[PDB]
Structure 1
Amino acid sequence: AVDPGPELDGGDFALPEGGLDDDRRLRALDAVDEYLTRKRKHLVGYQATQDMQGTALDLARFMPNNINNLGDPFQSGGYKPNTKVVERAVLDYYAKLWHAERPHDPADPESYWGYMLSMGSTEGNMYALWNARDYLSGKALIQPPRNPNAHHPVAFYSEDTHYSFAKAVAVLGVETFHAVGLEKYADECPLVDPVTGLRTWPTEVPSRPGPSGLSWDGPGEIDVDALAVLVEFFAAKGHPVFVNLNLGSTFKGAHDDVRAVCERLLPIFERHGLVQREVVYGSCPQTGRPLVDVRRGFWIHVDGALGAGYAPFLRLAAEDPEGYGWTPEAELPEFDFGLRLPTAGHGEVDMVSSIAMSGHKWAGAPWPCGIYMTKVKYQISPPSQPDYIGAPDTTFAGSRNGFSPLILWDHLSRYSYRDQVERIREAQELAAYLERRLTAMERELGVELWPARTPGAVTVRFRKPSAELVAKWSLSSQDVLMVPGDETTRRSYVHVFVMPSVDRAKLDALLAELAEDPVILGA
């Protein structure tokens, strides 16, 4: 099989007490560059854009600055070397793209609020679930200028949800429907397990079945029917509800049908008094009663780590296909802050409470970054009031990366909407091309590759090749059990993500190597 090339050797990097001379330092940095350069040119297995030569030329000049966007993006604060003016421009652009109300205005509850992340979307998902936990549990909101389960939120998300949510749930102590089901409602699961036929609580909301009848070969989209049954169960018990929906899922690149979910859940929320409800937020200032305000009892979060970066552009083309000269083959669901639905008796309800996106995914960046966005009306009173930063502590991070706003600003400034439509068009068409070539390879060589692509996704999955090929092309791997609870049914998959830095020549080079790979051939 192929050569992935040398790894870095730890001996070259050991840092002695006396320091390293300039020659040893440069040799080491050159080894890093040679390694990273070879790997970045061949990476096709992760949802991370690899080409930003232009941003490097333009933004290298900023590396001498210790930039810190400490505090809320909407006030400078005392740390003057900051890029909050740039950060606000990037936030504004995405607020427009996601049909949020702009400008940000602390006096307008419907207006957007958001900030740029210093980790990746893990930060945005953690923040979302923190914000939701406190909002749904009755903690105090930010300053303007009988039911025992009312304060016990329950989280719902599909089996294709990223591991950051399992992490966030544990960090924040938000209980999933699975945990609450087992603890409080052990024999009352409303779903029958398709393998066993028993009413056992599933660990996550089922995703849609594939040809097998099971989720492993399905599209990776949440089963809306299953979600609605589960949400109804807990809403009827009096619990407020947190739902995460994946817009570009980690392995399959699937898009949960956010509009279908919202249409199906709104009447459930209305029936069970979760559209508008009174909430006690601590005891009353002196005498032993409570205070009360009015809140919704549900929170829909869209994990658009990947997909919030391209879905607006695909949807633009879908709305005017002759203008963009492209009809996307798959429909991507309405998902953003513009999604508004009628009710029986509360008027139009704006359905989505928050969105996360990663900048190092579709746009590309040299480090993790991204955006969390919500609305003013959801903002929680900050944990404390630090004088020393001069700006409110409204964010998950303390010190914040102020170079990432420059990265994304530079990116966004170089492309029109039409250019952004072209980038998602080419990726969609090249993903379809890859799937076609993989099935043609199965016919030419008489090998099984198990190729699969969810319509509208920018990723294609297929049988895992040799370890050396996986290492050369940074293929991401996932094992599946074709029948849950049986380790004899394991299949090993990889996938390829067709990002804007992946072109036809790169895919053709990979395909030529797959065709001669010893695992692929010697099956």
Structure 2
Amino acid sequence: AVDPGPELDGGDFALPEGGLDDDRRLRALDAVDEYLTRKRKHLVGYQATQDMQGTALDLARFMPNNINNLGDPFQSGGYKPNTKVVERAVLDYYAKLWHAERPHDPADPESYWGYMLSMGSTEGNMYALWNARDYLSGKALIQPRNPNAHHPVAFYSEDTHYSFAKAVAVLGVETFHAVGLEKYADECPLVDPVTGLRTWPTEVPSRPGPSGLSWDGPGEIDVDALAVLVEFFAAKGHPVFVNLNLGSTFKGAHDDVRAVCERLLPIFERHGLVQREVVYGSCPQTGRPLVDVRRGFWIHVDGALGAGYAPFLRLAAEDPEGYGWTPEAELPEFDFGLRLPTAGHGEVDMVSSIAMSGHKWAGAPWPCGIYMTKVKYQISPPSQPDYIGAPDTTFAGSRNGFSPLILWDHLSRYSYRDQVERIREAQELAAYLERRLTAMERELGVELWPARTPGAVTVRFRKPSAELVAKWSLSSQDVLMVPGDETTRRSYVHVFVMPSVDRAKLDALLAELAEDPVILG
């Protein structure tokens, strides 16, 4: 019934040999603006903040500059039109927020190192897995018999973003599923709840919902299942990479990072993964190999979304009277401050890396974000180029130096208290949306299948008409309610309550949903 409005017409944008005159150019740019403006005002289906008027006014002035943050953020280098001083300020802010040790100091192994991304969190997840692959496999670091010792195995839940399947293929890192099928075909330690067979699952199971299966579950990793699987491979001598989702793509779930770490640390200690000798080369002499001591596990937090708000929710949880708000759900401790005792290695700082997207919670006009780790994990760069004047420590070559300005401007405009208010309002509006959807089910006598993981800023429900989906940029996911069986398909959409989503917007969507031909049946 509803109108998403006209798409852009390719004929208006065709670029001829002779160029376009000023009138045709302006007509085309006006068409783009009219399209983008309509869509941005109605987007509620993706985890991307849409309002940034203040930053546009503040930062339009920088568009004439070909800014390039080429090389490591902690040295200018030769390309002087760079914003690395701003980039370091942004990195410092998040280092504090995530309880990392600051300042960055190459002589302090425990201090943070990180950089701003030129893609989105895909770059941060790729970098994390590259960094972890090399660290766990014995490649040389920056700072000074078991056949599986150099064969890391990757673990993550079924709710993990597709960037990991991509990163694993790019980097040649083997998942527990691939290694299971290849080397350990009949030894899967988990029983499949559908078939009762010991078949290796493709990802670590997520927690079950009312169905007994993960499709209607919260989207959080099953800690028990993870621990069983990690023990299996750790006992075989494999080092371990674990990715944990802090604000998962479809359900906005938060893996219980503290619970995972508590449950895995004894496994790591039992199997000699807290501190182990690693050979990182050899030379022709009576003696040969070079050895150093490393951990044999790497825990990465994919906070693409959640690393931007979770610190603020946790601040309120710590001082609910001070912020005038008690969050309804507990968000897990997840950051560089998470430290656990051991039987005989002292306290262990559990997380090795975090990724976050700037175009998610904060909002940006293009993809950006942060990768952060510690100095002690940095890998020797792939080469030493004289011509950038700064080391090649990043995934990108040339880097977006406008993104530091975007995030700096944002962060400068809000206090911690203001940031707590933004996550509070989103949490409360997500709860409101869930309430209104069930009230709609009762008023109209229709099924909407609404679902919201406690503490998530997204609510899922039955997919409406294609036109409504297109108007409001609703993201879609199909599930089979019984894995394998194509007849059990349900189509869901979700709404992400970002800081640019307010009550009026949700009420306008809900009014259209109540008259939608698919919803009504």
User: TM-score scaled to structure 2, two decimals?
Assistant: 1.00
In structure 1, what is the Cα distance between the partners aligned to 2:166 and 2:430?
A: 31
SS at match of 1:372: strand
Q: State yes or no: 1:427 paired with 2:397.
A: no
Q: Deviations over 1:145-178 (max 9, x none)?
A: 8310000000000000000000000000000000
SS at match of 1:282: strand
In structure 1, what is the Cα distance between the partners aligned to 2:333 and 2:224?
A: 18
Residue 283 (structure 1) shift = 1.1
In structure 2, what is the Cα distance between the partners aligned to 1:106 and 1:147?
A: 32
In structure 1, what is the Cα distance between the partners aligned to 2:508 and 2:287?
A: 72
Residue 289 (structure 1) shift = 2.1
Q: Deviations over 1:223-249 (max 9, x none)?
A: 000000000000000000000000000
SS at match of 1:382: coil
Tell me which residue corresponds to 1:165: 164
In structure 2, what is the Cα distance between the partners aligned to 1:487 and 1:464?
A: 17
SS at match of 2:15: coil
Q: Deviations over 1:495-521 (max 9, x none)?
A: 000000000000000000000000000
SS at match of 1:37: helix
Residue 80 (structure 1) shift = 0.1
Residue 284 (structure 1) shift = 3.2
In structure 2, what is the Cα distance between the partners aligned to 1:289 and 1:403?
A: 48
What is the root-mean-square deviation of aligned Cα atoms in Å? 0.7
In structure 2, what is the Cα distance between the partners aligned to 1:60 and 1:289?
A: 58
Q: Deviations over 1:166-197 (max 9, x none)?
A: 00000000000000000000000000000000
In structure 2, what is the Cα distance between the partners aligned to 1:284 and 1:495?
A: 57
Q: Deviations over 1:408-449 (max 9, x none)?
A: 000000000000000000000000000000000000000000
SS at match of 2:194: coil
In structure 2, what is the Cα distance between the partners aligned to 1:289 and 1:476?
A: 56
SS at match of 2:518: helix
In structure 2, what is the Cα distance between the partners aligned to 1:17 and 1:97?
A: 52
In structure 2, what is the Cα distance between the partners aligned to 1:62 and 1:23?
A: 26
Q: Deviations over 1:382-422 (max 9, x none)?
A: 00001000000000000000000000000000000000000
SS at match of 2:409: helix
Residue 286 (structure 1) shift = 4.1
Residue 288 (structure 1) shift = 5.7
In structure 1, what is the Cα distance between the partners aligned to 2:287 and 2:504?
A: 72
Tell me which residue corresponds to 2:104: 104
In structure 2, what is the Cα distance between the partners aligned to 1:430 and 1:164?
A: 29
In structure 2, what is the Cα distance between the partners aligned to 1:283 and 1:245?
A: 35
Q: State yes or no: 1:66 paired with 2:27.
A: no
Unaligned runs of 5+ in 2: none
In structure 2, what is the Cα distance between the partners aligned to 1:191 and 1:290?
A: 39
Q: How many residues align?
A: 521
Alpha carbons of 1:287 and 1:217: their partners in 2 closer, same or farther (altered >3 Å)?
A: same
- The worse-fitting range, judged by mean Cα deviation, of 490-499 and 277-286 is 277-286
Residue 287 (structure 1) shift = 4.5
Q: How high is the sequence identity, in percent, across the aligned residues?
A: 100
SS at match of 1:190: coil
In structure 1, what is the Cα distance between the partners aligned to 2:3 and 2:507?
A: 17
SS at match of 1:367: coil
Alpha carbons of 1:285 and 1:44: their partners in 2 closer, same or farther (altered >3 Å)?
A: farther
SS at match of 1:355: strand
In structure 2, what is the Cα distance between the partners aligned to 1:84 and 1:487?
A: 52
Mapping of 1:171-182 within 5 angstroms?
171-182=170-181
Unaligned runs of 5+ in 1: none
Q: Deviations over 1:456-502 (max 9, x none)?
A: 00000000000000000000000000000000000000000000000
Alpha carbons of 1:269 and 1:17: their partners in 2 closer, same or farther (altered >3 Å)?
A: same
In structure 1, what is the Cα distance between the partners aligned to 2:49 and 2:283?
A: 52
User: TM-score scaled to structure 1, two decimals?
Assistant: 0.99
SS at match of 2:115: strand
Q: Deviations over 1:327-365 (max 9, x none)?
A: 000000000000000000000000000000000000000
SS at match of 2:114: strand
Q: Deviations over 1:192-231 (max 9, x none)?
A: 0000000000000000000000000000000000000000
Residue 290 (structure 1) shift = 1.0
Q: State yes or no: 1:79 paired with 2:60.
A: no
Q: State yes or no: 1:252 paired with 2:251.
A: yes
